[PDB]
Write a protein that binds this ligand. Sequence first.
Ligand code: MG
Ligand code: MG
Length: 137
Amino acid sequence: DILDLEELREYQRRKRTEYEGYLKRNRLDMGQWIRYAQFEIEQHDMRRARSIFERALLVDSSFIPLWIRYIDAELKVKCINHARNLMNRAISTLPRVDKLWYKYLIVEESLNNVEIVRSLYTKWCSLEPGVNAWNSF
RNA sequence: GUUCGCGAAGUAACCCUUCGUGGACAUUUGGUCAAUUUGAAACAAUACAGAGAUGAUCAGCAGUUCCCCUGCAUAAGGAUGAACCGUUUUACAAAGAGAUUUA
Ligand SMILES: [Mg+2]
Ligand SMILES: [Mg+2]
């Protein structure tokens, strides 16, 4: 397959033209947005990946799996702070979803950082959430 | 250049001519733009094919697109105008069983 810069180049251009055709006709079909982001990571170019996710949110934000994978896409490259700000935008966009709060917790427990998880459960309780929040706190 | 006025000289007899001087009349055009190759019409010819739903031969309407063309057109046509017809793994768990390691 690939030889040098120039071949890699053509191999990219072709893919991007193809996909974004297929996204051009379906704004929806989230899976497509995901896969295209995934390819974008495998090219070791993040900036584009960030965007591609963001666009994918501007279409639909209620679709959590995209939130999640746009987290893990930030973590698996071992860049955290992005995966924090993203979390503030996440739970703030959707407080009623547990999966976001729990995932942001685990992100702060595997980092051992407590001060957070204290103030964190302080919020996630302050909204009078439900039985499982208190129980887990 | 005109006209009014003054002064001078000459003609003169308050004028005709010349000179000097004062005043009045008249007042800012045009460029988004330089003169064929290097700041962009689009075709044609040649070659190759030779029309979507089917097992086959065809009528068509649409639908989406950061594609348009002809048309005065919010009419209607342009192969049903064309493109589409492909690639695809994670909100992730529960229970049972054997094996490995260990407080
Ligand atoms: Mg038509
Ligand atoms: Mg059509």
